[PDB]
RNA sequence: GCGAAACAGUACCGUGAGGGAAAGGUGAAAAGAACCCAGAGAUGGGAGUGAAAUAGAUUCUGAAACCAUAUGCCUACAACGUGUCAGAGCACAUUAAUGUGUGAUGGCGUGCGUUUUGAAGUAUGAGCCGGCGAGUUAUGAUAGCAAGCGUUAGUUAACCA
RNA sequence: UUCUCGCAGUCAGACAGUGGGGGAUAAGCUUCAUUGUCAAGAGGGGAAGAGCCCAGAUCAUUAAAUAAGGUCCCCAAAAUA
RNA sequence: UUGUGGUAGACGAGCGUUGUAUUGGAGUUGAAGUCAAAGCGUGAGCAUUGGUGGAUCCAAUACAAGUGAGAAUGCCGGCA
């Protein structure tokens, strides 16, 4: 293995760019519905709650 | 009232079509030089073949 | 970022009877003057953990494939002697040994002052101690002139 | 040739300059200055001064015929104007700019030199296409 | 590492403005309306890519019907004499181009007779 | 003197020294191709095709139509799948179209 | 893939024709007249050119109307104003304007197009036969 | 980019606690244009300098938007989200290619997002152009992928050379 | 579509027919159970229609046979008794 | 063989950018940026040349991102 062709066998996975383009959605949709409480900032609840 | 829809450049030139200005009237002066203004005196002080005015 | 720059603390405009968005602030990331929330900060460690035996095995394998590169000829302190460390005789020695193309490493256990003086102004070549070389520093040399003494240490380290 | 002389940003409405040079468009040297002289516009005097200056330069620095020249092309170029402000009632003021015009008039001495620019463009595209074609030989 | 990229955005906008031009108005000089018109025209082309053959079929049928009314019968009568008896597999548009070359479809009309 | 030649499902009228564009085909340029599916040569008609009819053509070139850029998009629904395509075709001419 | 379409273009000829109006039913004669003017019978119909023919109508007064339509269906006309509604019957047209009725009916049969006006110009309806169109080499026929 | 690369906490606003910016690039050396002309002059172009003055101080480049001119085509009967496909005609000559540009006429043709049961809409956002412009990281857990190691395995933490 | 795991998503649906409740058995009305459609789905016919009938679009296709429906013309084709 | 309508939502595969790291190359006999063009691409793109212009980068592989812009009565400037 040399720096001109240094590659592992395989290591890569899909990433979530929630505000980039329309390819996998991942935009205004954000993969969390539309006009929902979860979609809001810190939209969540207490773990026990 | 105030403007509701903007006028485009095509609309602008359609409105400005009447911007062409008419020409003036000219007259020949037998004694002085350049073509004078019709029904007006000439720069050389003379008008109906008549000089009544001082230095132009 | 936005919260770490001083400035005003008021809405620059009245709330009602306006024709724009109310405001964020005078200091806003969407306004001129910086304030981007995300970027480099002195909180990231920029470090990762690896097993010791993993590194030993990696070094052993890269030495195995390095030993077969037929550029691993032996060296001894004798030729590092008979020289004052001046690049002149060093330049002649490297040129005679066709080392201009190579970035050859010189493994050494003692780091004699003459060799340290030599090769100090050649970015192509580099030299350090036996137990200071990394895999990147190993495979980038394209050649290495090995010493008799380091064989015992590398065999012990496997 | 051109016999042009740029004015470099006199403050006047560009529309009025365009109008007066329409009044002078197509006309030759003998029938342009006379009418331009006594028309009641100030921009008329402005363009007349520069037209006389350009005629003088053409006679001096080019030595052309000077008796068949006519306006080849009028322009009305909007130079960078200034930003002035006058207060307006009930605390809502406005910024008023004095429009500035860049004025120049080209003087041609023949019924041509417009198609010759097309010939220059044709030579430009011809050298472009032959350079592309000569590159294809190496391809 | 702060990055500002304008070259790629500029070439993208230029290439998306390049397809369409010759438009009434400065619409072919902006990005928003130009892109909207490009997409609308693409939809127009998608629909017309079938509407054109839809209209061509009608054109062929109209012209063959006119030619057959020169012969003196309805369009439907001649079709029924192409599969079982007097088998013809010639298509509609060719029976029309046989009209632009006269004295050739007369052979066909004399063939469809008894 | 004429010929109705069928390629795929498209019929074409041809005569002597006629050049035309048809679907992309095998047997690349320079090679003669003799299609037996041709009808209406000279006053003779067969039911599926004209009997013993042989039309021989020589290919002049293999070309591509202009790249149509087709879109699918419904307003206010956020889908803009894009695709472009160049249509392969063959420009070729007939020589004899013998009986 | 496709066969190159072959049509005719830059070709224009409109043969002058003459018909004599009679007791024939207005609608069924007028549809045929319209299709002949537009050229729906030509083997070389050209939509963007419409190489039709000129036609002249003689003695439109002889047309009769079936049923009670002479006193059942009446044509109105509103020009631009409230109260401008003026309605006349078919027999009133016999007294004043029968040609214009056929004119408007045919124009109605023609789709509203820029060329449709140019096609109806090719129709010359006359209550009589006094005109200088004999020098235009007309064509006398029936059931046009 | 410390707010502030400049005479910046300066200009400015307020009677004050305070707020608060923008505006670098001549040339290799001003060698910043002797001299000429027209204009009162500024100025303009010559000359002249300079490798070069579409490098002349508006000073590296000078994009889009916007404003005019002109090659050539079409347009004064004309009901259209202005374009698509045809389609003669007209002007022609290319990243050699069913070459390109315009389009008499025909056929077709209620925008782009928003959220709503459902938006062609008289629901809202947009005057335009260009630039900038908003899902990262620290520790922690879970699930998946891979590799190392290996069934009294391993990893080392903080730390030391 | 059976079991584990990751992972949202909505809890405001709408309409026509079918059996209905309210209403006044009036409503593009409301409240259910069935089918279907739109939303998330283009197409033809119904003149122009989210909803009906015929139907489910990979790309090209100046080819054909068809579904509902239709054949005086606009606007595509039919007549005979 | 089924085939490829698709939002919400889920999976897969990529392109493009900045800089770094070595591995090669280009260049004031004209690189980058710039505008036009009668090409190439399944897609985000790749170009080839003409002219503006005179100085730095580019091909391949990984690396880590303030990385991909029409919209938020988004910000600056100019122009309508």
UniProtKB/Swiss-Prot annotation, chain A:
Residues 1-49 are annotated as: Disordered. It comes from the Bacteria. The chain holds residues 3 to 51 of 151 of the full protein. Residues 8-19 have a biased composition (Basic residues). Part of the 50S ribosomal subunit. Binds to the 23S rRNA. This is Large ribosomal subunit protein uL15. Residues 20-34 have a biased composition (Gly residues). Belongs to the universal ribosomal protein uL15 family. Coiled coil: none annotated. The lineage of its organism: Bacteria, Bacillati, Mycoplasmatota, Mycoplasmoidales, Mycoplasmoidaceae.
Swiss-Prot record, chain B:
Disulfide bonds: none annotated. Belongs to the bacterial ribosomal protein bL32 family. Coiled coil: none annotated. GO terms for molecular function: structural constituent of ribosome. Keywords: Ribonucleoprotein, Ribosomal protein. This is Large ribosomal subunit protein bL32. One of its GO terms (biological process) is translation. It comes from Mycoplasma pneumoniae (strain ATCC 29342 / M129 / Subtype 1) (Mycoplasmoides pneumoniae). NCBIfam families: rpmF_bact. GO terms for cellular component: large ribosomal subunit. Residues 6-17 have a biased composition (Basic residues). Residues 1-20 are annotated as: Disordered. SUPFAM superfamilies: Zn-binding ribosomal proteins.
Swiss-Prot record, chain D:
This is Large ribosomal subunit protein uL22. InterPro entries: Ribosomal_uL22, Ribosomal_uL22_bac/chlpt-type, Ribosomal_uL22_bac/org-type, Ribosomal_uL22_CS, Ribosomal_uL22_sf. Transmembrane segments: none annotated. SUPFAM superfamilies: Ribosomal protein L22. PANTHER family: CHLOROPLAST 50S RIBOSOMAL PROTEIN L22-RELATED (PTHR13501), LARGE RIBOSOMAL SUBUNIT PROTEIN UL22M (PTHR13501:SF8). One of its GO terms (biological process) is response to antibiotic. Part of the 50S ribosomal subunit. GO terms for cellular component: cytosolic large ribosomal subunit. This protein binds specifically to 23S rRNA; its binding is stimulated by other ribosomal proteins, e.g. L4, L17, and L20. It is important during the early stages of 50S assembly. It makes multiple contacts with different domains of the 23S rRNA in the assembled 50S subunit and ribosome. The globular domain of the protein is located near the polypeptide exit tunnel on the outside of the subunit, while an extended beta-hairpin is found that lines the wall of the exit tunnel in the center of the 70S ribosome. It comes from the Bacteria. GO terms for molecular function: rRNA binding; structural constituent of ribosome. Belongs to the universal ribosomal protein uL22 family. Keywords: Antibiotic resistance, Ribonucleoprotein, Ribosomal protein, RNA-binding, rRNA-binding.
Curated annotation (Swiss-Prot), chain G:
One of its GO terms (cellular component) is cytosolic large ribosomal subunit. Coiled coil: none annotated. Pfam families: Ribosomal_L13. GO terms for biological process: negative regulation of translation; translation. GO terms for molecular function: mRNA binding; structural constituent of ribosome. SUPFAM superfamilies: Ribosomal protein L13 (SSF52161). The keyword Iron does not apply. Keywords: Ribonucleoprotein, Ribosomal protein. Disulfide bonds: none annotated. Belongs to the universal ribosomal protein uL13 family. Part of the 50S ribosomal subunit. This protein is one of the early assembly proteins of the 50S ribosomal subunit, although it is not seen to bind rRNA by itself. It is important during the early stages of 50S assembly. This is Large ribosomal subunit protein uL13. It comes from Mycoplasma pneumoniae (strain ATCC 29342 / M129 / Subtype 1) (Mycoplasmoides pneumoniae).
């Amino acid at each position: 293995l040399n720096q001109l062709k240094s590659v592992p066998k395989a290591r890569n996975h899909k990433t979530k760019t929630l505000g980039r383009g329309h390819g996998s959605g991942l935009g205004k949709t954000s993969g969390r519905g539309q006009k929902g409480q979860k979609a809001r900032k810190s939209g969540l609840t207490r773990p026990g709650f | 009232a105030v403007q509701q829809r903007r006028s485009s450049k095509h609309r602008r030139d359609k409105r400005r079509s009447h911007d062409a200005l008419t020409a003036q009237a000219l007259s020949v002066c037998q004694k002085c030089g350049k073509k004078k203004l019709f029904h007006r005196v000439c720069s050389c002080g003379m008008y109906g073949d008549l000089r009544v005015k001082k230095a132009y | 970022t936005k919260g770490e720059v001083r400035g005003g603390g008021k809405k620059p405009y009245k709330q009602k009877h306006t024709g724009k968005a109310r405001q964020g602030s005078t200091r806003n990331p969407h306004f001129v003057g910086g304030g981007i929330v995300f970027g480099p900060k002195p909180n990231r460690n920029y470090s990762l953990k690896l097993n010791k035996k993993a590194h030993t095995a990696a070094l052993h394998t890269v030495w195995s494939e390095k030993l077969a590169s037929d550029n691993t000829h032996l060296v001894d302190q004798n030729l590092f002697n008979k020289t004052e460390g001046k690049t002149k005789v060093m330049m002649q020695f490297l040129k005679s040994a066709k080392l201009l193309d190579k970035n050859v490493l010189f493994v050494v256990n003692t780091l004699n002052t003459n060799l340290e003086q030599s090769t100090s102004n050649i970015k192509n070549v580099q030299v350090k101690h036996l137990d200071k070389v990394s895999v990147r520093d190993l495979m980038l040399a394209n050649a290495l002139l090995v010493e008799k003494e380091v064989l015992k240490a590398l065999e012990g380290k496997f | 040739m051109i016999a042009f002389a740029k004015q470099f940003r006199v403050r006047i409405s560009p529309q009025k300059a365009r109008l007066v040079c329409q009044l002078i468009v197509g006309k030759k040297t003998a029938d342009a200055q006379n009418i331009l002289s006594n028309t009641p516009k100030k921009a008329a005097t402005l363009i007349a001064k520069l037209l006389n200056s350009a005629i003088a330069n053409a006679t001096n620095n080019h030595g052309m015929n000077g008796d068949a020249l006519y306006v080849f092309e009028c322009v009305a170029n909007q130079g960078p104007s200034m930003k002035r402000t006058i207060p307006r009632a009930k605390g809502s003021s406005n910024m008023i700019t004095k429009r500035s015009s860049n004025l120049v008039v080209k003087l041609s001495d023949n019924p041509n030199e417009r198609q010759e620019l097309i010939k220059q463009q044709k030579a430009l595209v011809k050298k472009r296409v032959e350079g592309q074609q000569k590159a294809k030989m190496a391809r | 590492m702060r990055i500002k990229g304008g070259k790629q955005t500029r070439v993208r906008r230029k290439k998306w403005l390049k397809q369409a031009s010759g438009s009434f108005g400065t619409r072919h000089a902006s990005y928003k309306v130009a892109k909207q018109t490009v997409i609308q025209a693409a939809k127009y082309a998608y629909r017309d890519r079938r509407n054109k053959k839809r209209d061509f079929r009608s054109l062929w049928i109209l012209r063959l019907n006119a030619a057959l009314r020169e012969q003196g019968m309805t369009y439907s009568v001649f079709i029924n004499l192409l599969k079982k008896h007097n088998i013809e597999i010639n298509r509609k548009v060719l029976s029309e181009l046989a009209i632009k070359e006269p004295s050739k479809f007369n052979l066909i009309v004399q063939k469809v007779k008894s | 003197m004429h010929a109705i030649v069928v390629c795929g499902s498209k019929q074409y009228l041809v005569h002597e020294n006629d050049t035309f564009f048809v679907e992309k085909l095998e047997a690349p340029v320079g090679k003669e191709i003799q299609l037996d599916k041709v009808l209406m040569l000279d006053e003779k008609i067969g039911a599926p095709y004209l009997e013993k009819a042989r039309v021989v053509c020589v290919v002049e070139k293999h070309g591509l139509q202009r790249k149509v850029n087709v879109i699918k998009h419904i307003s206010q629904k956020h889908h803009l799948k894009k695709y472009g395509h160049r249509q392969p075709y063959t420009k070729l001419k007939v020589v004899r179209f013998v009986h | 893939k496709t066969s190159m379409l072959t049509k005719e273009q830059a070709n224009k000829r409109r043969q002058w024709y003459i018909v004599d109006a009679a007791g024939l039913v207005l609608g069924k004669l007028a549809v045929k007249a319209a299709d002949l003017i537009r050229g729906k019978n030509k083997v070389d119909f050209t939509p963007n050119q419409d190489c039709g023919d000129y036609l002249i109508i003689i003695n439109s007064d002889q047309v009769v109307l079936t049923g009670n339509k002479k006193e059942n269906e009446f044509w109105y006309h509103h020009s631009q104003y409230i109260g401008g509604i003026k309605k006349v019957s078919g027999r009133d047209m016999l007294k004043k304007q029968s040609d214009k009725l056929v004119y408007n009916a045919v124009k109605g049969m023609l789709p509203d197009n820029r060329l449709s006006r140019r096609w109806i110009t090719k129709v010359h309806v006359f209550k009589g036969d006094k005109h200088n169109m004999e020098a235009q080499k007309p064509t006398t026929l029936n059931w046009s």
